[PDB]
Design a protein around this ligand. Structure first.
Ligand code: ATP
Ligand code: ATP
Ligand code: ZN
Ligand code: ZN
Lengths: 146, 310, 310, 146, 310, 310
């Protein structure tokens, strides 16, 4: 894993092959700021990890929580003046607004200008994701597949 | 302002006990001393993107019995502009610019909830969004259960038929599960049994329910028998007919039923209730249908009116 | 009697500047202080022999907002007696014996003008006769242009898309060409460009117009951007998609547009306007649609009423 | 700055925001190998740029050429024992496969199991791409909106 | 004479182990040394009252591969047969006065056995009659399992998919149960489980079968994997989807199967066998399709030819 | 082996001058000394996914004229193919296990070239795929121009009609541009003009073409007049009509053409060639139709037969 930027977020120990999902998904790539991405690194235990450094951008509490389904052990270090002045972990959110697709093909959502929304519930063992529109409950296993 | 003034009526689970009651109390007032000039000068739009004549005709009669004007349609086929590229979003963005409330039935689940985001302040009411919700039917089923029994608490309600797929049985269970002391007997073919999640919720609240292979096993314990139509084509024809001595009510099965037991059905009925049942005084499905007017009048009166003096 | 009392509203070119204004001034009055009992006891017939839900629903809401009753239909298929040998002539000879005004949309050009000869004294209004006229849409487009800009004179209006075939663009040009100082930029695929005769008339009156290959070339000069839907099947699929970087509006193209510039479209819209446009304050198509009510109320109020005191 | 590995390919001078598009389109992340990505690296040299470093991996000939439509000026570098064993730049390939989508909406390439094939022809002012299947020729601008 | 001469093939239940073996041994010789003028001068009716172009095409190629002529039709999308109250009995009574054999697919279970009573002496070969039989598709399956396994006995057969309603899988179980040492594994969601009467027939003969939840539990010992289509219409849009992870076959899954393992499927294969299984040597559903030509030819030859010496 | 052996005919663009000449020289010998048992024992699929009975009938007569058997279908008016999400890839993968050649017409451009990737080794002959190719109709045109003109080079070819969308005329221009000294005259209304890329290909090879307004300007030096159908749906009812005088051919018009001049047309000919041109010796569209039999047979023979010595 690497070294210094002044000010910015460092998201370390993102599993491996998830570091790109997160970039792709939450569009962290549409800034003008330097971003450094490191893929399939050692220096985090598991050996293999992805890491993302976005300078001058700091992620909010809820943005931190959007990582949770993907990278639940991600540490979101807050850097100011070259040093880590804060560390957060992703907690589970109540609503994963925007990034998932309801597996129910007759949901109105598919065809339309609406951002998806699912109420998240139950911790770790099974996460049930309930679509806002069709009000159908699904195992995160199915939603997080197509 | 009344607690439902300008609210959107989309799903039963979105209404509290106190809301169901407010609705159900208004509906009994509008029944006895009607005010047929209360929505004088409002224009409600009846948009059936899926067509249903009995629900369309019930809601439009209710609009009329309060002196309102209707504009609206139906199809189950191409309508024209609605079909020509238009997203329900745009259809709603445009009709909320014309009318005062939108009642809408649609084939895809969540249709009326997406509408809620494009109607501005115009309330939209759900007349059935796919296999999800149909809050207006359950309100008249509860008004009828309350008006035949005296209460929505401590009832032994039996639900019969296609418990797996009927919209209505699922909403009726979630709504009665907001009141206390109820007992539910579920009588379904196991290809069509009650979903796990209805049952799971019922145990979180410590609500009593049991499963039965045939109506005769509970005939004597029951207060409300909610028949649902076993929809033939979900089964093999041979499969469908093979089942025992069926789950259809005949007048002679009513011999041991309590004096206050009423039979309810959302309609259409066909071979699930035989004609001789219509004659007995436990037959209540057509009166139920009639309470459709009064229940929907309450809901229209309440969403569209500041304070109801009745 | 008002200048349009008992007149037939068939075609835009049949209304003078002073008529367009009378209409447009009434429509602003009925908007602010409405009289919802003004056509109390009239029965208007809504005859859509071609079906259009948004126009049907707009006109019927207008009939209702003035306290009138509607009888009417729609089809785009066999209706029954209307189809069984009947000439539109006979259909009209018979409904003019029942109703007070006829609003009618029909697939063949000239349908509402032939009607005028068989309706006796009953006024008939055209809701769209084939590819010829649709005077009611242009009246609400002008009411909206006037209400966003302050005038119908000295406007730089850009018309976009299928300028060859869209009814609406042709009528809007003939109507604004009755006012002074207007400048028109026409942005069309050349397979679908403006007809020679619209242009020929515009030069007889010495009216300024120019042709542009893309909206960005005029983005900054424009007051009204009238988007029209490029209708896909008139082109080859490959042909249709191949065109440059298109003629579709996106929010970022609006960056250089004046503060008072509004985007208008007759609807349906689909890929000609992207959603991010809906958010910007230049998006005006749904408010436009809403002015449909007020504009058509004026026209109904005027044809059917002796003197309007408003 | 992002700058040293023992062996591999360093794709340098990717013109900003294309550096993400290249990872996705050419699926460079589906390797469990050291990748260092630097997005919106300044370099006064070009204003702003992106850089992919894939370690112990060497793109070859054809692979290098596809980049031409997207990052036409990328300097591709063979690093082979801690320094630059040879450079290359994108040459326009005779056919682009799999990455592009047919504009022809009725082109059958849309429903079926088939990867797109387009043949490149620099038609004087720009490049025209003829689809394998519907044989319709299109302005690469039209194509790259898709 | 050969034992299947002039015999009507209606059911797998009417064919014996020895007949299965003779039809499969003929197909073998017909695949190897083809007899293209064997049914020379014979006219076969291919009467598809239910449209099924892939079975149709197979049967008709098979008829031409042997020199037979073909007349016949495909209806469902209305030809004319079975209207003006004409009975299937009269229809077959008239077609037997021309053709030498009748091949028919019909939408009602039992039709092919009724044709049998009116054809007199023209053999009736059943290409599918409602939810009941389809012998010709079992014969091609058996011929494919024997081609690839070398055996029809002592096999380990997994049956994956909708086994409740899968007609194909019910006959292959009854056909295979005619031979020895076969072991079955049924993998199906609970609402689509192998019906009881099949399970009863298996037990009664002493045949071994287990139920599994994932294909993965059984991959290693499986010889034949018969996939069948999950008919989405038999489940909810939401039920289908949330099978928690699904029953699709993917080439990764097979990274474990024995060398001899072959994935079969009656087709269409839509969603359930992914494209990457096609490049795998275990993929055999298309080669299965082509062996329908040989099982079909065996049958037409044996039924119409009194002593076949090949 | 012959050069077209086992080769798939998908486009005119993939056939060379030499191939055009070999297919046309074969047709010549097949028209003169016919070979009715050449494709004896071969089964060809005629799969018309898009219904086109005149091409169908031609291709199938051609198959029978050579002893081939035919299986296949015509859809558009629903058979069953291309539903339950079955892909064209799987459909061709299954039909290649029976037939010796596939003839297919399909509504999407590119289909025939996709079939090519899944047929393996059964040749795929394209009888029309969307707005793109149709080699078989160019080959019969070329054979008719060579039959009557004696030459495929140094010709004066007028192309009259809808050249924008005329698929037939675009391939004949590319085919003829393969030979020398040809001069073209394009006569089309401005909205239906010969697209640019054709015009570019012509110039780039040094070929001479002019645009004319009336057929009359060019009658005297024209050798081949290829009429094409003006598709009225591509124009307004009013646009079509008012072409000021029209582009119809009438026998009076030909009172001027050279002795050798022949009027060709792909058909239907509806309005554009009047009945009196039929009695004229220049009328050749029906004789053109009958030479499709010979071009079709040439092709089936060369693709399926390794060395044809006739
Ligand atoms: N100035 C900086 N610029 C960029 N990244 C930095 C900076 N400082 C720390 N990081 C990154 O933060 C990670 C280590 O930070 P930090 O000290 O917060 O870790 P820790 O989990 O608190 O570890 P520990 O107790 O072992 O010191 C590394 O991936 C270094 O990648
Ligand atoms: N050993 C290496 N490992 C990883 N990357 C390297 C290596 N050597 C060079 N690079 C990357 O190559 C870029 C500079 O290489 P190089 O010297 O080829 O550039 P140039 O364009 O030829 O510049 P110049 O003339 O200014 O030296 C830098 O982005 C540095 O990160
Ligand atoms: Zn949903
Ligand atoms: Zn294409």
């Amino acid at each position: 894993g690497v070294e210094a930027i002044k000010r910015g977020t460092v998201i370390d120990h993102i599993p491996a092959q998830i570091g790109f999902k997160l970039l792709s998904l939450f569009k962290l790539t549409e800034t003008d700021q330097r971003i450094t991405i490191g893929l399939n690194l050692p220096s985090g235990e598991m050996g293999r990890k992805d890491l993302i450094k976005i300078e001058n951008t700091f992620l909010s509490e809820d943005q931190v929580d959007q990582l949770a389904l993907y990278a639940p052990q991600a540490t979101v270090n807050r850097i100011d003046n070259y040093e880590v002045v804060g560390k957060s972990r992703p907690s589970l959110p109540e609503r994963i607004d925007n990034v998932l697709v309801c597996p129910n093909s007759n949901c109105i959502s598919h065809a339309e200008p609406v951002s998806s929304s699912f109420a998240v519930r139950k911790r770790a063992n099974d996460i049930a994701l309930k679509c806002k529109y069709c009000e159908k409950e699904f195992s995160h296993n199915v939603v997080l597949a197509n | 302002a009344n607690p439902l003034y300008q609210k959107h009526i989309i799903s039963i689970n979105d209404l509290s006990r106190d809301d169901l009651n407010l609705v159900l109390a208004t509906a009994a007032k509008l029944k006895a001393n009607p005010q047929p000039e209360l929505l004088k000068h409002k224009v409600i739009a009846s948009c059936f993107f899926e067509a249903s004549t009995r629900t369309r005709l019930s809601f439009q009669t209710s609009m009329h019995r309060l002196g309102a004007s209707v504009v609206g349609f139906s199809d189950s086929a191409n309508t024209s502009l609605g079909k020509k590229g238009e997203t329900l979003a745009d259809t709603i963005s445009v009709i909320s610019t014309y009318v005062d409330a939108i009642v809408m039935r649609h084939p895809q689940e969540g249709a009326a909830r997406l509408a809620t985001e494009f109607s501005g302040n115009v309330p939209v009411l759900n007349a059935g969004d796919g296999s999800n919700q149909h809050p207006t039917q359950t309100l008249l089923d509860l008004f009828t259960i309350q008006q035949t029994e005296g209460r929505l608490d401590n009832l032994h309600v039996a639900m019969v038929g296609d418990l797996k797929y009927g919209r209505t049985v699922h909403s009726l269970t979630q709504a009665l599960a907001k009141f206390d002391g109820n007992r539910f007997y579920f009588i379904a073919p196991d290809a069509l049994a009650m979903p796990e999640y209805i049952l799971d919720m019922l145990d979180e609240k410590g609500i009593a329910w049991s499963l039965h292979s045939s109506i005769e096993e509970v005939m004597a314990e029951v207060d409300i028998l909610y028949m649902t139509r076993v929809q033939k084509e979900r089964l093999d024809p041979s499969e469908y007919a093979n089942v025992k001595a069926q789950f259809v009510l005949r007048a002679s099965d009513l011999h041991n039923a309590k004096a206050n037991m009423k039979v309810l059905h959302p309609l259409p009925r066909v071979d699930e209730i035989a004609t001789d049942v219509d004659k007995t005084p436990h037959a209540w499905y057509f009166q139920q249908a009639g309470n459709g007017i009064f229940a929907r009048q309450a809901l229209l009166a309440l969403v569209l009116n500041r304070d109801l003096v009745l």
